[PDB]
């Protein structure tokens, strides 16, 4: 099949990661999808050795080898690859940077952030604390690690980066501020939220 786009190469996933390894956060390629001929894929770089592969489903192809008139990414329809780059990918990159730039974002591993929170709770036994960190084994996820006070357990919740915001439990929170507010609401019993 023929795809006329500046960032299209018929790589597989591994080739794509090797190609992007020396690039920067947000750099990407459009590529061949593993199995099928009505699929394409985008691989993009989130961080050092951290890449996400995004599937594109085609609809309304004139024939097996033709580019679909409608392209679907994570449940959303788009007209073409350039629209996906502007409305889907650039958004996801925006949101990734919004979260990692936050004062409550911690670089470092799950274990490191858990230890930071344990230690902090030791010193401030009455103060709640929470941090976000990158899930390095499941690209595109974040940990939300928190502890209410010294008498309570440390917990780990999970946040998924989407093109519309940060998915936590129920909603796709469109900003980091709304995400933290939503987290705080989810800490309350259901009958004392509103």
Burial string for 125-146 (b: 16+ CB within 10 Å, else e) reads eeeebbbbbbbbeebbebbbbb
User: How many angstroms separate the CA atoms of 80 and 45, rounded?
Assistant: 21
Taken in order of first residue, the domains within the chain and their CATH numbers are 1-97 (3.30.505.10), 98-194 (3.30.505.10)
Number of H helices, E strands in the chain: 5, 12
58 CB-side CA count, 13 A: 22
Residue 124, C-beta contacts closer than 8 angstroms, at least 6 positions apart: none
Q: State how far the alpha carbon of 8 is from the alpha carbons of 3, 28, 82, 145, in Å.
A: 7, 9, 11, 38
In this structure, the strands spanning 28-32 and 8-9 are parallel
Under 8 Å between Cβ of 57 and 39: yes
User: How many angstroms separate the CA atoms of 164 and 69, rounded?
Assistant: 23
Q: What does this entry list as its resolution, in Å?
A: 1.6
Under 8 Å between Cβ of 143 and 156: yes
For residue 25, the Cα-to-chain-centroid distance in whole angstroms is 12
Under 8 Å between Cβ of 112 and 106: yes
User: How many angstroms separate the CA atoms of 77 and 99, rounded?
Assistant: 26
Q: In what order do the strands lie in the sheet with 50-59?
A: 8-9, 28-32, 39-47, 50-59, 70-73, 76-78
User: How many angstroms separate the CA atoms of 157 and 180, rounded?
Assistant: 12
- What kind of experiment solved this structure? X-ray
Helices within 9-80 (DSSP H only) = 13-20
């Amino acid at each position: 099949r023929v795809i006329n786009h500046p960032y299209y190469f018929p790589f597989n996933g591994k080739q794509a990661e090797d190609y992007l390894r020396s690039k920067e956060r947000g750099d990407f390629v459009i590529r061949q999808s593993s199995r099928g001929d009505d699929h394409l894929a985008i691989t993009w770089k989130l961080d050092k050795d951290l890449f996400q592969h995004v599937d594109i489903q085609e609809l309304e192809k004139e024939n097996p080898l033709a580019l679909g008139k409608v392209l679907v990414v994570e449940g959303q329809r788009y007209h073409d690859l350039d629209q996906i780059i502007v409305e889907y990918l650039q958004n996801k990159i925006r949101l990734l940077n919004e979260l990692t730039s936050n004062e409550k974002f911690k670089a470092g591993t799950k274990k490191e952030v858990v230890k930071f929170i344990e230690d902090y709770s030791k010193v401030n036994p009455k103060k709640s604390v929470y941090y976000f960190s990158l899930n390095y084994e499941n690209p595109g996820w974040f940990y939300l690690i928190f502890k209410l006070n010294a008498e309570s357990k440390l917990y780990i919740w999970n946040v998924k980066l989407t093109h519309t915001g940060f998915f936590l439990v129920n909603y796709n929170y469109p900003t980091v501020i709304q995400l933290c507010n939503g987290f705080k609401t989810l800490l309350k019993s259901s009958n004392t939220r509103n």
